[PDB]
């Protein structure tokens, strides 16, 4: 079971049916592929991270989390206040598993100021005068832990006793928040690979997934990305997403032993044959997009030979745009129109993309589309999909159904997208 | 059966009789090595042998393990108050009953019969922190347990490791010199292992001044004087192959 | 020019990308097919023999005129590489842009 | 052997040698040498051990004879004692045959009779040897209907071109103790040698022919026995005016 | 550390001036950079990857030889206590950080040329006062001296203690298993070069053992059959390129320690060393140890060129003198092959074949070098390769004694 | 050829055709054939292999194939550079211990570590140079000092 | 042939070239199999 | 009582390398870790013993190479890369 630690990217879709899809939807194309992966990444842990995010430095947080085993078998068992808690050991005498004296119990019931004595000497009791790491250290032991506060990190937090003692000691929403943990556990399975949002010690059997995009700024653990990346970099532990599709893992592109020429690699073949009669007849907030590498070439020489050309990377073009236009890999389409302008579909790809860079380096370029450049490009070929993932769209750039205004410099191609695109369909009401 | 059993088995002797149940010692020795090839270094496939042997041992032994008397002796001398957070807390934490049937104990005994294929070692977490002082009482009790359990393990380096544990806790009050380059009295005890790093003072306790480091000198002499002497005994039957390689 | 950049503590916390390994052919020059050989079918039959006729990839260029040119990492394999390369067209083209 | 406190007698490694190192093609030492301890490590908790030490009790009427006699009887109802012998014998036969087969394929190696040496065979590297051993190992397992390992390890890793197994352990004093385990008298290998020897004389019965092939255009009208021509061969390699084609 | 060293400049082979070109200086030590650790910057794993076959520096040793000659013109402060200039170039600062053309306002005095100049650290007090920064000079000066003292191969020292290897060295060597000799030599040079170290340091002992093991395997006494604590070197096939060796660790029987501590000085007696990487690497590696620990004892003058007779602090003929042995690779190879047959690693037929291959291989080296010398006559003013005569390739030297030493060194 | 062992690129057959010109088939005597026919039989494939441990990767291997000298010289130099800043574990662990004023003493196991490489070090001159460079890329007012 | 002595020259010795004056295309070389362990892979770090 | 499962314990088939995960980076270390984790030992209890060890893996060839498919297929691949046409069509054939 090789583990891949995952840090979500800028607009990682979270409410997706499967976290797996937002990573790279190609992994879901084949049953033979999707059966090789486990996910973990439980919600309770997600909520804990959301809270503690404002109270720990990146180094501390990484140092604390890195030791936790994959399936968290432990629980945090909150204790009620001593006056409330003491009654439990007499409501069920056998529940007094520490066998605290009956006299002390009813002395607590009598006292105006019930002391911590009922907590005192209980093994693995965590007082409020404790720190985050204290919990995490015990988490590695797998056994459940008894705590005196809700702000804890590393294990699902559930009530030790029935709700009657905690009621009054806590309030409705607080009493509500622990319900999934009260019956927390679920099994974890031994497939070939298991993705995880939980960090871990990078090593021979643990890898860091590299997607070549900015992190989710809102995701609380994005601050760990630099330290993790550099440690992986210095030991050659990064994995490009394409590597996951191969039968055996290796960090690299164009390996000797594999031609990487298979329907699984071709992200353009998006297919949806299965169904479940689910309410999402479609979830129009989830959008699959791709990052593609395209080769551009100019006219051949006087003897039919052609220059080496240049290849650029286009970022996050929506895939359905290409599929609906019957675009296919490994086909050298003509780039220029009769009047020398770009063919419309290329312009759409550029317009809906996020950024264009040189393929190798990370330098962004603004492409010219006129008669300026000498030896201008006339042919284009898409070579491979560097990444192919679904992304959440709901309310991201704009917020109100009323209206929205987009500012662009003069000379933009807004006319193309507002006229040609709906005209290319002209059958369904767009605008 | 070491003549614990006496048996009789009648059989008729026909001219044409076949009982293919014999093998020479060479065959057994060859077979034994072949296991080493098949096991390779995969610890996972070596463990079951010790597991099975220990299981048989428990199913056979007349010995009975019961800490009830020990509990009574402890509880009366201790105050047993859910107080005394001093190591009464600690030893109680280890005294309280375990549902593991003391499997660790039996594993050690089983490993003896298979040493050279698998060795029991003191668990890494059992050692005290080498930066900790002897005054930290739980650390002291840990060293006590390690010293007691030392001889049970099959690890040949257990004597040194046991010695170094105490030396670590006595780093400040007993600053001895360790004649091993690349090592120090504060080095974690569990790290020593390889024979080349056995401290010369441990090899020869006379290198430790009594007036300067009394406890360490006494401890070394105690170890060198009381650590048990190994022995041997026969088994099996002379009518069969031996399968032994070295012994 | 004039890109005055301030020293940043976190910026230098990346480390250079030292480990780059190639499994392809350790070469940087390519043999080319600058002028293709003609396909004769009526007269002069037999003066030319293309390995394609036997369904074989020739180990050497089999054009009428063949050149040696500099194309770095043309046979590279295994991972992306440094990201800057030198590629010269055959001398039948200008190739000025490289300079 | 346990060593107590004699530093010069402490064991540092336990290794299995497929070939005596003086004869080894390259170092190719045992993988075990990469491990910190000479054997697999099993961590145990001292506290549990201590408890067992401190509380050991007996029943009130323990008669050692009665207890042990009752306890040991069920074990001897097993047959493991004999299956051990039977499997060991089969292992020997498979080992000898497998070693012999690989030796006959490589151009030089462990000393074995080579009746089939006249046949053409490229010199087998280690990878090829693994294929051959795998075939032999599978054949025996199917034949004798066994389960378990048998010769698995030899093919799966290390060099299969083995010669004579031996085990050894090294002491800190530099002394090394080595024990060889040469196989005893084998039977199957002996008759297999006979089979190969007679095949080399009866290959025609297996639809295999020896010798070269002529291609003279004969347009006769009488008898014809190509498998046993009576006429003199048209020419030979050293004959006058006989050319030999180039390498390509 | 070690607060003192002694040295000796090169000898002019009848030529009037130090034999190096300005371009050589500008090439090999220019750019205002520090020249004090560059000896390996122009070496690699094998000759196949290096431009040693033609043009300037057409030999493996050529660059280092030129370096030594270059230093001989600028080490005056350790001879006369003053920085000087030669052909308009001098040090930039009293720390001798780098070289530069002389200033126009206050030039330093011009160096008066001489050869075989003895050198003392004490003549230049600022060195000790800045020992922490001027440490690298110690290594290079020592190396230059160790080469200048001998015609043909440079001199280096061997020793083996009566004790077993310490664990630290054992662990260190277990990490250098598959490494070729050339890479190992770099680390040793890199280690002792860049900052002061005490002789009682683990690396020092480690490298000391390496030189011993290398020689023992070179003589063929250490093999797969017989090893030092499990370690030994493996040499490439003479049929392809024997000028290569790597470290190995093995099950073989461990050789017993010698009855008494053994030590001696060594050098190659034949010109083959100039174009043979294992010799250069082995010498540099061994010389690194003496650089940090100093010379254990005076070298015997008995078998050294005339200028080396009775050099103060370096050579002697008295009681406290360690003999120096020498060998020729070809007879050495024959001895190594013979030991292999006696150990049973090979058959007699193979031993004859190996001798034929190695002799053929060595012939090419001789043929290449002898043609290279006439291409670069020393009268041209620069010495890319040390001069020699044709008969020098045939000397057997003290090879028989050498293998006898290994016989006594690894019992 | 049976007599040699070669690299099976195993997915780039067209590349394999280029890598080993000696394996050509020569039907007719063309100018290419006139040259290729002269190729020596065995100057191909793996020449020697450094094999240390059974069931373990060979640390390095020597072979001959299509490879220009110039690129070869560069890459060999690059490896040489990497070695120049690698050190064995004993040095590494000692460095860490000293960095902590001999607190947190630690050590390494004793076993074979075949193919490790840890290019993590540099000379003082490198550090001195970098420190000076760092001082050059700041505004020498308080803005530089305060973060430190 | 001068571009290919390693391929066609009978007298070609392994480990030779004429780099400063001419580039050959077919030569012998080494290939490596290094591994890049992390710190804990090198030494036992003081966990927790 | 006399349970055979506790008496007939022998190494299973493919024992020396069964747990090896499919990878190319450091197969021997990865395989060693898999064995350790498979055996139920946790790293926090093995201590220093876990750092340097290595174990045989399927990804490693007997010759000592990194393999991604069974060696026979590698042989098949190179063989298939060279198959000249048996019968060709040219005008001058007699």
Curated annotation (Swiss-Prot), chain A:
Function: Minor inner capsid component. Displays NTPase and RNA 5'-triphosphatase (RTPase) activities. May function as a cofactor of polymerase. Associates with microtubules and plays a role in the formation, structural organization and morphology of viral inclusions, where the assembly of cores and the replication of viral RNA occur.
Organism: Aquareovirus C (isolate Golden shiner/USA/GSRV/1977) (AQRV-C)
Any single GO CC term annotated in Swiss-Prot or TrEMBL for this entry: host cell cytoplasm
Single annotated GO MF: structural molecule activity
Keywords: Capsid protein, Host cytoplasm, Host cytoskeleton, Outer capsid protein, Virion
Annotated family: Belongs to the reoviridae microtubule-associated protein family.
UniProt-recorded name of the protein: Microtubule-associated protein VP5
Coarse class of the protein's main subcellular location: virion
Subcellular location: Virion; Host cytoplasm, Host cytoskeleton
Keyword Cell membrane listed: no
The UniProt record lists the keyword Nucleotide-binding: no
Source taxon at top rank: Viruses
UniProtKB/Swiss-Prot annotation, chain B:
Compartments (UniProt record): Virion
Residue numbers of the full-length protein present here: 424 to 670 of 1214
N-terminal signal peptide: none
Assembly mode: Homodecamer; each decamer is made up of two conformers of VP2, called VP2A and VP2B. 12 homodecamers assemble to form an icosahedral capsid. Interacts with VP6.
Sequence similarity: Belongs to the turreted BTV-fold inner capsid family.
Protein name per its UniProtKB record: Inner capsid protein VP3
Annotated function: Inner capsid protein that self-assembles to form an icosahedral capsid with a T=2 symmetry, which consists of 120 copies of VP2, with channels at each of its five-fold vertices. This capsid constitutes the innermost concentric layer of the viral mature particle.
Curated annotation (Swiss-Prot), chain E:
GO CC annotation terms, alphabetical: viral intermediate capsid
The entry's keywords: Capsid protein, Intermediate capsid protein, Virion
Record carries keyword Hydrolase: no
Family matches, as InterPro entries: Sigma_1_2_reovir (IPR004317)
Chain ranges passing through the membrane: none
Pfam families: Sigma_1_2
Main location: virion
Keyword Transmembrane tagged: no
Cell compartments where the protein resides: Virion
Similarity comment: Belongs to the reoviridae clamp protein family.
Biological role stated in the UniProt entry: Located at the interface of the incomplete T=13 outer capsid and the pseudo T=2 inner capsid, 120 VP6 subunits clamp and stabilizes the inner capsid shell.
Assembly mode: Interacts with capsid proteins VP3, VP5 and VP7.
Name used for this protein in its record: Clamp protein VP6
Organism listed in the record: Aquareovirus C (isolate Golden shiner/USA/GSRV/1977)
Gene name per UniProt: S8
């Amino acid at each position: 079971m090789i583990t891949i630690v995952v840090i979500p990217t800028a607009h990682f879709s979270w409410t997706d049916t499967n976290f797996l899809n937002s990573v790279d939807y190609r992994l879901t194309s084949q049953p033979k592929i999707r059966d090789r992966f486990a996910v973990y990444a439980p919600g309770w842990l997600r909520r804990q991270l959301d809270e503690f995010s404002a109270s720990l430095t990146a180094s501390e947080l990484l140092q604390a989390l890195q030791t936790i085993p994959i399936p968290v078998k432990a629980r945090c068992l909150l204790l009620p206040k001593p006056k409330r808690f003491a009654q439990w050991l007499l409501d069920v005498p056998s529940a007094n598993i520490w066998h605290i004296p009956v006299t002390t119990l009813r002395a607590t019931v009598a006292s105006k100021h019930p002391s911590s004595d009922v907590y005192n000497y209980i093994p693995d009791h965590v007082p409020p005068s404790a720190e985050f790491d204290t919990v995490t250290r015990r988490v590695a032991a797998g056994r459940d832990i008894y705590v005196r506060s809700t702000k804890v990190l590393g294990a699902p937090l559930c009530l030790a006793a029935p709700a009657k003692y905690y009621a009054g000691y806590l309030s409705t929403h607080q009493l509500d928040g622990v319900y999934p943990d009260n019956w927390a556990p679920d099994n974890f399975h031994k497939r070939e690979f298991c993705l995880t949002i939980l960090p871990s010690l990078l090593g021979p059997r643990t890898f860091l997934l590299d997607v070549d995009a900015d992190r989710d700024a809102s995701y609380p653990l994005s601050v760990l990305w630099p330290q993790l990346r550099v440690l992986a970099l210095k030991s050659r532990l990064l994995l490009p997403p394409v590597a996951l599709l191969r039968r055996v893992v290796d960090p690299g592109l164009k390996p000797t032993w594999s031609a990487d020429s298979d329907a699984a690699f071709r992200a353009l073949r998006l297919s949806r044959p299965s169904s479940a009669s689910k309410p999402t007849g479609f979830d129009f907030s989830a959008l699959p997009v791709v990052d593609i590498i395209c080769l551009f070439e100019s006219e051949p020489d006087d003897h039919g030979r052609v220059a080496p050309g240049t290849r650029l990377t286009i970022h996050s073009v929506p895939t359905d745009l290409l599929t609906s236009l019957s675009i296919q890999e490994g086909v050298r389409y003509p780039l220029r129109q009769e009047s020398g302008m770009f063919v419309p579909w290329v312009l759409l790809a550029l317009l809906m993309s996020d950024d264009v860079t040189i393929s190798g380096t990370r330098r962004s370029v603004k492409l010219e589309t006129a008669h300026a450049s000498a030896r201008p490009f006339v042919h284009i070929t898409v070579e491979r999909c560097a990444s192919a993932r679904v992304v959440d769209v709901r309310g991201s750039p704009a917020m109100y159904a009323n209206a929205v205004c987009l500012t662009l410099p003069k000379g933009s191609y807004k006319s193309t997208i507002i006229d040609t695109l709906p005209a290319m369909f002209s059958d369904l009401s767009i605008l | 059966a070491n003549n614990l059993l006496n048996s009789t088995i009648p059989i008729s002797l026909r001219p044409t009789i076949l009982c293919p149940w014999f093998a020479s010692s060479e065959d057994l020795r060859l077979q034994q090595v072949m296991h080493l090839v098949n096991i390779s270094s995969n610890t996972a496939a070596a463990l079951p042998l010790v597991e099975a042997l220990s299981t048989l041992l428990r199913s056979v032994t007349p010995l009975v393990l019961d800490p009830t008397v020990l509990t009574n002796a402890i509880t009366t001398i201790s105050e047993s108050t859910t107080q005394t957070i001093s190591p009464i807390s600690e030893i109680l934490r280890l005294l309280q009953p375990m549902g593991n049937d003391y499997a660790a104990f039996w594993k050690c005994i089983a490993s003896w019969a298979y040493n050279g294929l698998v060795t029991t070692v003191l668990s890494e977490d059992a050692f005290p922190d080498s930066s900790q002082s002897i005054t930290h009482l739980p650390s002291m009790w840990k060293c006590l347990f390690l010293t007691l359990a030392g001889p049970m393990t099959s690890d040949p380096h257990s004597p040194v490791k046991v010695f170094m544990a105490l030396a670590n806790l006595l780093a400040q009050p007993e600053p001895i010199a360790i004649g091993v380059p690349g090592m120090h009295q504060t080095t974690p005890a569990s790290q020593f292992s390889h024979p080349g790093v056995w401290p010369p003072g441990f090899l020869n306790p006379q290198l430790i001044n009594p007036q300067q480091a009394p406890l360490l000198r006494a401890f070394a002499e105690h170890i060198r004087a009381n650590w048990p002497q190994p022995s041997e005994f026969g088994y099996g039957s002379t009518l069969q192959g031996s399968a032994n390689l070295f012994i | 020019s004039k890109h005055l950049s301030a020293y940043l503590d976190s910026a230098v916390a990346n480390g250079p990308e030292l480990i780059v390994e190639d499994t392809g052919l350790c070469t940087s020059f390519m043999l080319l097919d600058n002028i293709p050989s003609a396909h004769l079918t009526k007269e002069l039959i037999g003066f030319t023999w293309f390995m394609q006729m036997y369904q074989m990839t020739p180990p050497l260029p089999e054009g009428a005129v063949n050149r040696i040119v500099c194309m770095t990492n043309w046979a590279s394999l295994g991972d992306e590489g440094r990201g800057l390369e030198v590629r010269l067209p055959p001398p039948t083209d200008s190739s000025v842009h490289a300079y | 052997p346990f060593t107590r406190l004699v530093q010069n007698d402490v064991i540092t490694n336990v290794l299995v040698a497929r070939v005596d190192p003086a004869q080894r093609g390259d170092a190719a030492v045992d993988i075990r040498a990469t491990h910190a301890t000479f054997a697999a490590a099993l961590p145990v908790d001292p506290a549990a051990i201590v408890v067992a030490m401190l509380c050991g009790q007996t029943e009130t009427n323990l008669i050692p004879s009665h207890h042990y006699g009752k306890a040991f009887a069920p074990l001897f109802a097993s047959n493991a004692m004999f299956t051990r012998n039977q499997r060991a014998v089969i292992t020997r036969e498979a080992f000898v045959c497998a070693r012999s087969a690989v030796a006959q394929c490589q151009d030089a190696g462990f000393l074995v009779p080579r009746p089939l040496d006249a046949l053409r065979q490229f010199d087998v590297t280690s990878a090829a040897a693994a294929e051959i051993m795998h075939a032999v190992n599978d054949a025996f397992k199917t034949a004798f209907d066994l389960d378990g390992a048998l010769l698995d390890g030899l093919a799966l890793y290390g060099d299969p071109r083995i010669a004579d197994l031996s085990a050894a352990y090294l002491q800190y004093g530099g002394n090394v103790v080595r024990e060889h385990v040469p196989p005893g008298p084998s039977h199957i290998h002996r008759t297999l040698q006979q089979v190969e020897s007679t095949f080399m004389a009866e290959m025609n019965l297996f639809n295999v022919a020896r010798g070269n092939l002529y291609l003279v255009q004969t347009a006769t009208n009488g008898n014809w026995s190509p498998m046993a021509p009576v006429a003199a061969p048209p020419f030979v390699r050293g004959g006058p005016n006989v050319r030999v084609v180039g390498r390509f | 550390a070690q607060r003192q060293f002694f040295g000796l400049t090169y000898n002019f082979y009848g030529q009037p001036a130090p034999l190096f070109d300005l371009n050589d200086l500008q090439e090999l030590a220019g750019c205002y950079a520090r020249p004090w650790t560059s000896r390996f910057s122009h070496l690699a794993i094998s000759t196949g990857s290096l431009p040693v076959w033609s043009a300037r520096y057409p030999s493996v040793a050529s660059r280092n030889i030129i370096v030594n000659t270059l230093l001989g013109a600028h080490l005056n402060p350790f001879a006369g206590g003053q920085v000087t200039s030669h052909q308009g170039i001098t040090w930039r600062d009293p720390v001798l950080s780098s070289l530069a053309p002389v200033p126009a306002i206050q030039p330093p005095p011009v160096w008066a040329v001489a050869e075989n100049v003895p050198l003392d650290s004490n003549n230049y007090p600022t060195y000790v006062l800045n020992l922490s920064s001027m440490w690298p000079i110690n290594q290079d000066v020592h190396i230059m001296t160790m080469w200048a003292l001998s015609d043909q191969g440079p001199i280096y020292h061997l020793e083996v203690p009566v004790d077993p290897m310490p664990a630290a060295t054992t662990a260190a060597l277990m990490a250098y298993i598959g490494v070729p000799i050339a890479h190992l030599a770099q680390t040793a040079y890199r280690f002792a070069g860049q900052l002061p170290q005490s002789p009682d340091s683990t690396m020092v002992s480690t490298i000391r053992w390496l030189s011993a093991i290398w020689f023992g395997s070179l003589t063929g006494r250490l093999n797969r059959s017989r090893t030092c604590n499990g370690f030994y070197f493996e040499f490439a096939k003479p049929a392809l390129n024997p000028d290569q060796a790597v470290l190995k660790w093995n099950d073989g029987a461990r050789a017993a320690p010698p009855a008494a501590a053994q030590s001696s000085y060594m050098r190659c007696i034949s010109p083959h060393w100039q174009h043979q990487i294992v010799e250069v690497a082995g010498a540099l590696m061994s010389q690194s140890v003496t650089a940090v620990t100093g010379l254990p004892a005076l070298i015997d003058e008995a078998t050294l060129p005339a200028w080396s007779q009775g050099v103060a602090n370096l050579t002697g003929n008295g009681q406290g003198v360690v003999p120096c042995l020498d060998y020729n690779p070809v007879p050495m190879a024959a001895a190594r092959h013979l030991q292999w047959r006696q150990d049973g690693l090979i058959t007699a037929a193979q031993e004859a074949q190996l001798n034929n291959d190695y002799t053929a291989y060595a012939l090419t080296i001789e043929r290449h070098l002898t043609a290279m010398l006439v291409a670069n006559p020393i009268a041209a003013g620069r010495m890319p390769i040390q001069p020699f005569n044709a008969a020098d390739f045939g000397q057997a030297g003290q090879t028989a004694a050498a293998v006898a030493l290994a016989q006594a060194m690894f019992v | 050829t049976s007599g040699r062992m070669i690299r099976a690129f195993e997915g780039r057959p067209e590349l394999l055709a280029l890598a080993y010109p000696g394996r050509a088939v020569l039907p007719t005597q063309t100018k290419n054939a006139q040259f290729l026919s002269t190729a020596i039989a065995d100057r191909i494939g793996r020449l020697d292999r450094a094999n240390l441990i059974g069931g373990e990767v060979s640390a390095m291997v020597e072979c001959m194939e299509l490879c220009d000298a110039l690129t070869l010289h560069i890459r060999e130099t690059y490896v040489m550079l990497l070695r120049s800043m690698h050190q064995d574990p004993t040095q590494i662990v000692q460095i860490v211990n000293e960095c902590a004023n001999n607190l947190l003493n630690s050590t390494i196991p004793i076993s074979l570590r075949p193919t490790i490489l840890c290019p993590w070090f540099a000379s003082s001159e490198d550090l001195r140079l970098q420190q000076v460079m760092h001082l050059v890329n700041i505004s020498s007012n308080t803005a530089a000092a305060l973060p430190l | 042939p001068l571009r290919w002595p390693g391929l066609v020259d009978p007298n070609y010795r392994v480990g030779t070239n004429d780099l400063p004056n001419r580039i050959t295309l077919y030569n012998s070389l080494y290939r490596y199999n290094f591994t890049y362990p992390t710190l804990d892979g090198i030494m036992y770090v003081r966990s927790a | 009582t006399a349970s055979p499962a506790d008496t007939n314990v022998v190494p299973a088939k493919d024992a020396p390398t069964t747990n090896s995960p499919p990878s190319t980076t450091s197969p021997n270390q990865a395989a060693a870790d898999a064995n350790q984790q498979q055996a139920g030992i946790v790293s926090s209890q093995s201590g220093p013993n876990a750092v340097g060890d290595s174990a045989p893996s399927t990804s490693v060839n007997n010759d000592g190479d990194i393999i991604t498919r069974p060696t026979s297929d590698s042989i098949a691949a190179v063989a298939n890369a060279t198959k000249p046409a048996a019968v060709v069509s040219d005008p001058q054939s007699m």
